[PDB]
Every structure is written in structure tokens, then in C-alpha cells.
Amino acid sequence: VGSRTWCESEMLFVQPDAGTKEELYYRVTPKPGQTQANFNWTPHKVRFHDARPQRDSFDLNTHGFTFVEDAISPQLIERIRADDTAAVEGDYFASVAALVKRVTGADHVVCFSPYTRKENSEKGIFGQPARTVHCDHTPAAAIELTHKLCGEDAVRLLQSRFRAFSVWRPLVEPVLDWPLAVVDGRTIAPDDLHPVHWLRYEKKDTEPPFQLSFSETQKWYYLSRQRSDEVSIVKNYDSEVVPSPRSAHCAFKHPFVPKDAPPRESIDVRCLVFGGR
Ligand SMILES: COC(=O)[C@@H]1C(=O)C(C)=C2O[C@@]3(C[C@]2(C)[C@H]1C)[C@@H](C)CC[C@H]1C(C)(C)OC(=O)CC[C@@]13C
Ligand SMILES: O=C(O)CCC(=O)C(=O)O
Ligand SMILES: [Fe+3]
User: Fold this and answer.
1) Are strands 108-118 and 220-222 parallel, antiparallel or unpaired?
2) Contact predicate 81/116, CB 8 Å
3) How many helices (H) and strands (E) does the chain have?
4) Rounded to whole angstroms, what are the CA distances from 193 to 59, 72, 80, 81?
5) Are 109 and 167 in contact (CB under 8 A)?
6) CB within 8 A of 210, min separation 6: which ones?
7) HSE-up of residue 129 (Cα within 13 Å, Cβ side)
8) Which atom of ligand 1 is nearest to the CA of 270?
9) Best CA proximity match to 112, nearest among 93, 128, 84
10) Sign of the Cα pseudo-torsion (178, 261, 115, 204, in order)
């Protein structure tokens, strides 16, 4: 079940054969009598390798994720846990953009779609830890978001280095239960990827994310006891041919944490990233 540097748990995947017929969709809040989806989630046991002993070795080009030290003030953290929207869209966005610029050297970073999560929250499923394995954007979705956020400039930006990240930070520390797991992007096979339309509304309203199916080839990691000063950057899209075009991520129930541990709290923000290395 566990050893010094790994543990075992489960996550929700899609079937390897999902989406070979029609487009997959999942309704977030289906009405009575409405069909919720044309596929089922399937749990699979996964071995989670602790990234802690090799923390500084993981790289956004090689692995599709990286961990970076970046302390923020206790007051910004309490403002965020208080759902202070102005603190998120102002101070925290600025913090994330600046962090991403240190890490990559990018010329331009655009933050969007922040989600503050709390273990079995009341703000719905996007305010709760993610239980299905996903990559936030397909290429089409990343391209669409660049047009939507960057206007005219997109015609030039989309032809050089373009990346999209999820930037994830614990708001209570250390994280014990429901840690964010990330996969070595070199171990994702193209057939593991399944676009799924998340219907927040009656109709498709954006381009979709990828949901993953399980494979024994996938090498899954987690950073044990992650602190509020330790930020996970998880790559959802990259225009450059690098060993990991993307990673994928999801939370899992940790087998060795006490039942009565406090709820996990975190904030994640997506970012479009232009230029850099
Ligand atoms: C339990 O829900 C999760 O596990 C994930 C989640 O928590 C969130 C917040 C999501 O946002 C998505 C899809 C995921 C990754 C889901 C799978 C949808 C639901 C709304 C925002 C869009 C958007 C920003 C328009 O960009 C897109 O490319 C389309 C997909 C996302 C990123
Ligand atoms: O906090 C979680 O459980 C999921 C976070 C996430 O999906 C993201 O950062 O894109
Ligand atoms: Fe995500």
C-alpha cells in the first residue's frame, strides 16, 4: 500500500475506448430525465511516487510540471480563503504572473479562471478537489482562449512559443489528504487522451479539456506534505516539441492520513504564457 517514497490509491479515468463513437459530454447539473453523459468514469488503482526526494529535478519541458518556492503573505492567503475576489484578480494574479516569468522568462503571462477549492465545499464541484484525471485544455481550447483573451495580438502570438499552465498552491498547510497528483508527460500516450465537453449549461459553450484513460505506462507523482510556499506549475499545453507536450493532474484520497485531518484548501489559476524557455 505504501513505502518510503510512494503510496497507492485510486483516481477516476475514462475508458481507453471512450470517444471512438460520438463526442463525449458530461453535464455538470443535469435536469431530471436528462442524460448526464455518454460515458462512465472508471476508477483505477495508481502508484503515486513522492516527488519530495527529487523535488527540484522536475522540469516543465522534460516532465510537464515543476515545483517552485514562492512565499506569499499570510494576509493575502486569508483574503483568498475569504473569497476576496479583488485580492485574487489583483494581487494574486500579479503574484502568479511574476512567478511564471521568473520560472520561464516569458515575455507575457495572462491569468484567468481562478478556482478556490475546499474539501467538500459548498460552491459546487469546481470549488472542490478534482477527482477525474484531466488536462485543462485541448489544443483547440488553448488556441480559442488566446483569441478570446489576446485579441488582435493572437495572430502573431500563436506562431511563436505558446504554453498554458495551471498554477496550484495550498491555502492550508501542509497538504495531507487530497494532494494534487501530476503525471510525467513523457509517459502519456496519445490514445490516453479523450476530449470531453463539460456542459455547465444546456449547450457546449467552449472547446473542451482532455480527460485521460489509465495506462500502466503512466508515471504518477505527488509532492508529499506540500506547503503554501510550494507552488505546483502543471503544463496544459505547449507549442514546442519537448519531451512532455503536457502533463495531466487530479487529486486522490491519501491512504495514510487521519480521517479527522482538516479539509484541504487550495487555489489554482490558469495562465497563457508567451515566449520564454
Ligand atoms: C471537476 O472539474 C474539473 O476537474 C476541472 C475543473 O475543476 C475545472 C475548473 C475545469 O475547467 C474547465 C474543465 C475543467 C478542467 C474541469 C475538468 C471547464 C469545466 C470550465 C472552464 C474551462 C475553460 C477555462 C473555459 O477552458 C477550457 O479549456 C475548457 C475546460 C475548462 C478548463
Ligand atoms: O485542486 C484540485 O483538485 C485540481 C486543480 C486543477 O485541476 C487545476 O489546477 O487545474
Ligand atoms: Fe485542472
Assistant:
1) unpaired
2) yes
3) 5, 15
4) 22, 35, 33, 33
5) no
6) 134, 135, 137, 138, 193, 194, 195, 196, 246, 248
7) 24
8) 24
9) 93
10) positive
**137 CA → ligand 3 middle, Å:** 9
Atom index in ligand 2 nearest the CA of residue 117 equals 1
The per-residue b/e assignment along 29-50, b for 16 or more CB within 10 angstroms, e otherwise, is eeeeeeeebebebeeeebebbb
For residue 237 the three cell numbers come to: 499545453
How much distance in Å is there from the Cα of 21 to the middle of ligand 1? 23
For the chain, which domains are there? 45-188+212-274 (2.60.120)
Contact call for residues 163 and 143 (beta carbons, < 8 A)? no
Cα separations in angstroms, 234 against 19, 38, 67, 132, 237: 25, 28, 9, 16, 9
**Cα(33) to centroid of ligand 2, in Å?**
30
Q: Rounded CA gap, 143 and 110, in Å?
A: 13
Overall resolution, Å: 1.9
